[PDB]
Design a protein around this ligand. Sequence first.
Ligand SMILES: Nc1ncnc2[nH]cnc12
Ligand SMILES: Nc1ncnc2[nH]cnc12
Lengths: 392, 386
Amino acid sequence: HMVHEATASAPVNIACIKYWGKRDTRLILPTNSSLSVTLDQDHLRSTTTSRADASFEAGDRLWLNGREEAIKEGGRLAVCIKELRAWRKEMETKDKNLPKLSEWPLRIASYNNFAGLASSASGLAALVASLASLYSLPQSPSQLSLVARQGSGSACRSLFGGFVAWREGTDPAGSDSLAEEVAPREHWPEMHALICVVSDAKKGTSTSGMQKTVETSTLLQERLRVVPKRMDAISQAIKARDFAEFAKLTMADSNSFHAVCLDTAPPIFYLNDVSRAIIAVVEELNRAAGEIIAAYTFDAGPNAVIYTLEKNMPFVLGAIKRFFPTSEEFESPFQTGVRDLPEGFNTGVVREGGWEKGAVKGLIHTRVGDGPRVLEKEDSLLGENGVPKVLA
Amino acid sequence: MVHEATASAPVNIACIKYWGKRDTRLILPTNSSLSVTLDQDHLRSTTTSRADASFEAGDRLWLNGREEAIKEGGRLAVCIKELRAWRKEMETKDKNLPKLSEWPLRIASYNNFPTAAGLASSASGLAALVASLASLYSLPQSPSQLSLVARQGSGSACRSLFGGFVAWREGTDPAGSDSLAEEVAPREHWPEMHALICVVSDASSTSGMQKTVETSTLLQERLRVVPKRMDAISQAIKARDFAEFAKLTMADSNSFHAVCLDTAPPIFYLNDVSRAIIAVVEELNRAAGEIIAAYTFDAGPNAVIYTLEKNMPFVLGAIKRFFPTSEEFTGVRDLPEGFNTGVVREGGWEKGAVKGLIHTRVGDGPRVLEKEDSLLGENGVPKVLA
Ligand SMILES: Nc1ncnc2[nH]cnc12
Ligand SMILES: Nc1ncnc2[nH]cnc12
């Protein structure tokens, strides 16, 4: 009984130039280009096993984190599977001797090792990489990113390692809305990142959200004029390894994104009081250093990502650890240490009384990473009958 | 013959926000703004001015019982100089008048704001100084003309020279002659307009706003949008259309805080309690089936919630349901049916997260007061000293 199965992981990525707004909601074509750093799969990843077998019971089945997920026709997962099956069928049409993998049911199981960390970009990228390997697709990562983009917009940027653009494109059919390497991981491997996972228990109760910004935010129209300039500038900065300009652009575009969220009617809020305190600390770190050594950025929630070159991570750790005692124990994967605040650091930028333990829940030290990884049989999430090994 | 005048001036709250100066010396703004003047029965700044030929040379001023320096070329000094010059014009035309302009000034001011409210006081404070000196000197100048002096001395002070609904017109004259306040509608036009100030627990405007001017790209689009909001909100006020007034007020408040966020470094005034109040007001409007309340936020986390007098019980009820207030600081209605309490953290907020509530309403312009209201003793020193 021959087994046709592939397992792949894909990385998380954190946008420096933010995706926020679609011009086509079905194809997921964006209102502007975006640009991200791919993070190290040694620390954060999604992993997906896909198997096709002529003897599986009819109908595809998919599990996420051990719970079966319905694959409704037309939805994000179904569309991705349909496009990748079509590319496999094309191979079979050209070479009639190939086994007819495209005709068989799929069994798919995925897990991430993650807090409020956005899991859809790495998750859909892992699905695409896994199925592309299962089907031995000839398509390039760029071509595969067209499919990932339709599962979840920022998933397309997780098809590459290093520093990665999503080019907005101008084709109404989306053929040029895809990811592109701006610089590979080996160009600037010292780019590290500290993720600050923030408690968010004082609020009430993104795809629906960002379209409300498109519909109602007057300030968004100026953001769309500014983003191309930041794309060009941050690409130059990465190519030049100019950390200060990379950092300035990253902080400016993060704040720009949260600004147009605030300008939405009704307003959209993601930063919380802890997020703002982390910004104050990073801003004061750069000021006291007399040099921009760290850059915060925030996606659609209060967690901070702080970019810094490895050599300056002890300053970032020192500042965060000084003001934000964590409930989770912290070990750097590299045993990176902690340095005292630069002389002149104004501790008054943090509230009187400080922050209670757990206001920041925990820290994750990671760095710029490679693209998706095809794994070995040993890593499979599926048992011998095609049902996941772990069911929640 | 004692020459002494006491006047009060109101606080005002901008619906269309002033944020950004095109001229920092004359205080000319990057855009027009528009506010509601609040009732001096509730919040007021009060200033007594006296001129006397036998005072010791040099003007003196006290604020809340503490003496304040009036250095030449400073804001207060230039304000006094301009008003003195208008008085000297009177004495030139009428040689019989006493030479009040030639005599030293003793000035005392006080505001009645609640302890720890976080309310900005410089605007009503300078408006009261201007009204008091104009009364002392018997100046003929109109409120509009006086607002030029208030504007130069303290910006949005110019909008407190009028009651009701007041515009600060940005003007185009580089010397500022047309950057002044103008009445959009008097208090009597819409006296039903009430306001609930929510004093929020909070763990620099002048320098701050110029950083936004220097660094915010989104500000440049805000400056294109504000004239549209000014026209629309003036029409809504004239039509007494609360829902349109409310939408514009909430939109421009959020626009202001957005360009603060887009400043480099970013400026943050709203906090998590501010955000919760916004969630409650928006859900109140939804559950009520019509817009009955409008939040707005200035340079800090305090909320001001506009509402017609008849709907204040709903607004007060919703705020007191989720934000129990402090001891250190009225009929209420239950939440409308269908209000989703999920828009607030479970169980609401701790007591004192909102410290207290001030219920006020649209009010008239500055008031000239009586001898009994004087802040000065017989010798021209304040009655109450710190
Ligand atoms: N790991 C994953 N695989 C597929 N879809 C996902 N959506 C979120 N995470 C996912
Ligand atoms: N009442 C007042 N008088 C003068 N200047 C002030 N600044 C703030 N409040 C004031």
